[PDB]
Amino acid sequence: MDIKSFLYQFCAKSQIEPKFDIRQTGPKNRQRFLCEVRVEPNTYIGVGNSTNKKDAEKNACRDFVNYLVRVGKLNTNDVPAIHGNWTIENAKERLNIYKQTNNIRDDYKYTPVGPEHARSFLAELSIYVPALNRTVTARESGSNKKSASKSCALSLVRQLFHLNVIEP
Amino acid sequence: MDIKSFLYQFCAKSQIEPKFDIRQTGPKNRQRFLCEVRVEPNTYIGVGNSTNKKDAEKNACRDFVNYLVRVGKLNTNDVPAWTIENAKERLNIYKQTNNIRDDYKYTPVGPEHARSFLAELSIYVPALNRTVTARESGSNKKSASKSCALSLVRQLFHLNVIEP
RNA sequence: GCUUUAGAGAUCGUUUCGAAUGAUAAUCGUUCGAAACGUUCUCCGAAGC
Numbered sequence: 001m002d003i004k005s006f007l008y009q010f011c012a013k014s015q016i017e018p019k020f021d022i023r024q025t026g027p028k029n030r031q032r033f034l035c036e037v038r039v040e041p042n043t044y045i046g047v048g049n050s051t052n053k054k055d056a057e058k059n060a061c062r063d064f065v066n067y068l069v070r071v072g073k074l075n076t077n078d079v080p081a082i083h084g085n086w087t088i089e090n091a092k093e094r095l096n097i098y099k100q101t102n103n104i105r106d107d108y109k110y111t112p113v114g115p116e117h118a119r120s121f122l123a124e125l126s127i128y129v130p131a132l133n134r135t136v137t138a139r140e141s142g143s144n145k146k147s148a149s150k151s152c153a154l155s156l157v158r159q160l161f162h163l164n165v166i167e168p
Numbered sequence: 169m170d171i172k173s174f175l176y177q178f179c180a181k182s183q184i185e186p187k188f189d190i191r192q193t194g195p196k197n198r199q200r201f202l203c204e205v206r207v208e209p210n211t212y213i214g215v216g217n218s219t220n221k222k223d224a225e226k227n228a229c230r231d232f233v234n235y236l237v238r239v240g241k242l243n244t245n246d247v248p249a250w251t252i253e254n255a256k257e258r259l260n261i262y263k264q265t266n267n268i269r270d271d272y273k274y275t276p277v278g279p280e281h282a283r284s285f286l287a288e289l290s291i292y293v294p295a296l297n298r299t300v301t302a303r304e305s306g307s308n309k310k311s312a313s314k315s316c317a318l319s320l321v322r323q324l325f326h327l328n329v330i331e332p
Numbered sequence: 333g334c335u336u337u338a339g340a341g342a343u344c345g346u347u348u349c350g351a352a353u354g355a356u357a358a359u360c361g362u363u364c365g366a367a368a369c370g371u372u373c374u375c376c377g378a379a380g381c
Binding site for chain 3: 169170172173174175176177180181183185192196197199201219220221253254255256257258260261264276279280281282283285307308309
């Protein structure tokens with residue numbers, strides 16, 4: 001496992017998160033990063049250095065884990081190393097149900113938009129409705145595939161609502 | 169360019185760095201994120217918030233930058249809305265004379281979560297009229313490039329076209 | 333301009349953990365966090381030519 005994943009997983013129990021602070025300190029060409037981390041209820045602050053902040057974060061993390069090992073809060077063995085009230089929060093989950101219920105094994109096709117450093121997507125899906133002998137389809141943009149797939153599913157649920165194939 | 173990179177690229181102009189402080193707010197059925205941001209020496213605190221961290225910091229930046237324009241440090245139009253180390257360096261100038269505009273052709277192989285890249289490049293050298301080629305791989309395109317570039321160069325230091 | 337090297341920020345993919353919304357397995361998904369391996373762009377200290 002990863003040390004920083006592990007500490008977040010230790011706090012996740014208590015609905016809190018580790019609170020990191022960080023400050024750079026060196027010559028601007030061999031610069032060094034100083035990192036501290038707190039977690040409530042504890043007063044102790046775990047510190048770590050490195051030439052980059054990702055690593056400084058983890059050295060700090062392992063030192064906070066050392067402290068909870070050292071004050072016996074952890075054992076050494078557990079440690080490693082509204083169109084009918086359908087919208088974006090609700091449409092994708094809803095269309096999923098429809099998809100499962102009518103064994104519509106097809107899935108969203110994505111196409112990339114824009115450059116790699118500013119990538120977005122289109123999500124495309126078509127559902128055939130044998131009852132009405134008729135296909136609804138959508139191609140909607142989104143900042144990522146997940147986002148795109150929901151606005152796609154939103155377009156599809158709305159059209160299917162407007163055909164009394166779906167409730168609200 | 170996004171609002172927070174902007175704030176950083178405006179701070180690099182002084183070798184100073186923004187400083188963020190993030191905190192959660194609401195309970196399990198409705199939890200939110202509060203982000204505060206400071207740029208020394210300015211006393212101003214930028215404040216943003218939202219359902220997720222990234223958007224909470226972008227809001228905190230946008231607020232801070234909105235401050236900097238009000239106080240005259242920025243202007244609204246400025247804001248948005250033979251080895252692998254020397255192998256590459258030596259090959260690019262061998263390529264530089266012969267106006268060879270051909271570049272590395274990369275090919276991603278393996279699972280997306282553990283890529284490897286094939287790098288290929290061929291040079292129709294005219295000294296002999298063999299056309300020399302390299303096909304090497306790395307776990308990222310720069311590594312693949314260098315190993316590719318290195319194969320090439322070693323295949324000419326051994327055919328006496330490159331002083332070692 | 334090219335190379336080597338210490339960095340920073342953004343972008344997206346795939347993968348993987350965690351937190352949250354009678355039962356066994358299977359399968360698709362929603363919100364938040366964290367990690368792995370990578371792509372792309374911008375910023376940038378130093379060194380060589």
